[PDB]
């Protein structure tokens with residue numbers, strides 16, 4: 001019993017983290033086989049941050065301008081190139097601790113574990129979600145750039161996020177591992193507005209199912225609703241519309257609890273319209289939207305890696 | 306910016322988890338050097354769960370009655386002994402991934418990371434706290450027994466908790482690595498209820514300081530208070546008393562923000578007497594008490610391991 005914000009074990013990713021220094025700038029790199037991946041803004045200076053010409057900057061750099069360190073070992077950079085907003089440093093040594101991995105670009109509403117690193121050394125691990133506006137509400141200090149987000153399937157690490165920068169409201173922006181930013185953000189110091197955010201409806205329903213599995217049932221009513229009538233209420237409260245795919249995705253949790261998805265929608269419909277009256281659900285006084293249906297099934301069925 | 310439930314990197318602990326099998330019972334063990342540690346109730350049967358004679362059960366066992374498995378590697382048992390409520394299996398092979406470690410018995414209010422395991426394989430990592438009533442509010446399913454809690458100092462792993470059993474209200478009870486239970490709980494099927502819990506006051510104050518660091522300052526008022534006038538209010542709301550040591554421990558956070566501790570106590574007093582009025586602090590509508598002052602400093606200053 002119990003329900004916690006649970007991350008994947010971080011061991012496979014720890015052995016890939018290195019430190020990348022260019023000039024006076026230090027951040028983190030991902031060492032996989034003989035390539036180190038890091039944010040290309042490492043080559044930027046204070047005189048360039050407003051609108052850097054990364055092509056011109058990279059041309060000026062040589063291999064010896066990149067200091068890559070893996071613990072005590074300094075890795076020689078033998079080549080450097082740029083793929084979108086990610087710098088790829090070819091090094092002379094393949095990482096012997098390279099796990100099975102793949103690069104994945106995730107969808108809004110999906111979650112992943114972050115290994116927060118500073119100076120190439122891991123600091124902590126936590127779980128977060130790709131918001132509908134393509135930001136992430138992470139915990140990142142100066143120099144956290146190059147920390148990665150990931151999921152673990154079978155025995156294969158799916159890398160889905162590299163951290164680049166903080167946004168005015170304190171949220172964070174980054175890329176996939178091919179260097180394509182999530183959302184409209186760019187790697188320069190400029191006025192960047194994140195779009196209006198919405199609540200991930202299918203994740204709230206999954207978290208409500210997690211509550212029922214753990215005995216928290218007070219919010220259940222005897223009503224049901226149609227998918228169209230629910231979305232008229234979800235619209236008013238800035239909730240993502242619910243699709244039939246979302247309903248089918250909640251199939252496993254509905255079968256485990258014996259509560260039809262449209263029944264749970266009617267309970268959530270009443271929660272949005274009436275509030276929670278100062279009561280709690282799974283030790284929270286707000287509706288949580290950063291657990292996917294798969295997350296709840298993983299934690300309430302106990303899969304291992 | 307940002308503030309998350311952040312666990313330590315789990316790689317050092319992952320390389321210590323093994324599977325222990327006695328008869329038809331399987332749970333997790335901790336492999337350090339040539340010794341495997343696991344809960345002693347693995348030698349218990351269904352007809353013994355009400356009141357088992359562990360002395361009788363151990364003396365009749367032989368080394369070949371224990372199956373220890375580290376992934377695919379079968380560890381041959383060359384000795385077995387019992388210390389309090391933990392079984393110690395001496396194996397022929399020392400764990401080549403044994404990290405710098407020590408065994409530590411934590412105090413109520415201190416936090417630790419939990420690596421949840423099933424069949425000797427890690428499933429996920431999360432952050433927990435030792436409640437004042439000596440339970441932990443974890444996420445543990447059947448067979449999670451033997452999963453450990455830990456803290457990491459530089460490169461030394463301080464093991465502080467081993468999971469044993471679940472209590473009626475869905476909270477969890479366990480031991481330190483010497484086999485001594487936290488609280489008055491015993492490893493048998495009997496009527497044992499956790500005592501009424503209280504809130505960790507020094508942790509709430511540190512969490513308020515984390516909020517001020519992240520720009521959440523609406524709860525700061527013009528009042529101050531004395532240590533005694535605050536403790537009179539904290540006792541009324543089932544909060545743990547605030548000691549002078551707690552004030553000194555909050556020294557770094559008070560100096561970072563420039564807010565005196567007694568000033569923050571006056572803000573917390575108003576929050577307890579008037580509620581939060583539906584407002585949030587760091588994304589939560591309740592007062593969080595599972596961040597120690599050290600946890601706040603670690604996340605807001607960025608120490609690594």
Ligand SMILES: CC(C)(C)NC(=O)[C@@H](c1cccnc1)N(C(=O)c1cnc[nH]1)c1ccc(C(C)(C)C)cc1
Pocket residue numbers: 025026027041042044049140141142143144145164165166167187188189306
């Ligand atoms: C853009 C603002 C808000 C001023 N700062 C950040 O985002 C900041 C930071 C702070 C906290 C968390 N994440 C990142 N960040 C760094 O800490 C950093 C860059 N290199 C090493 N460290 C950063 C990232 C990118 C840049 C550009 C060169 C692209 C403009 C500059 C600084």
Ligand SMILES: CC(C)(C)NC(=O)[C@@H](c1cccnc1)N(C(=O)c1cnc[nH]1)c1ccc(C(C)(C)C)cc1
Pocket residue numbers: 001330331332346347349354445446447448449450469470471472492493494
């Ligand atoms: C005591 C109750 C509440 C009925 N069950 C648990 O606590 C339960 C469990 C369930 C969920 C989380 N943690 C533990 N638990 C096990 O899943 C287990 C034991 N060995 C392998 N698995 C367990 C622990 C201890 C015992 C005895 C000491 C009585 C023998 C029996 C079962």
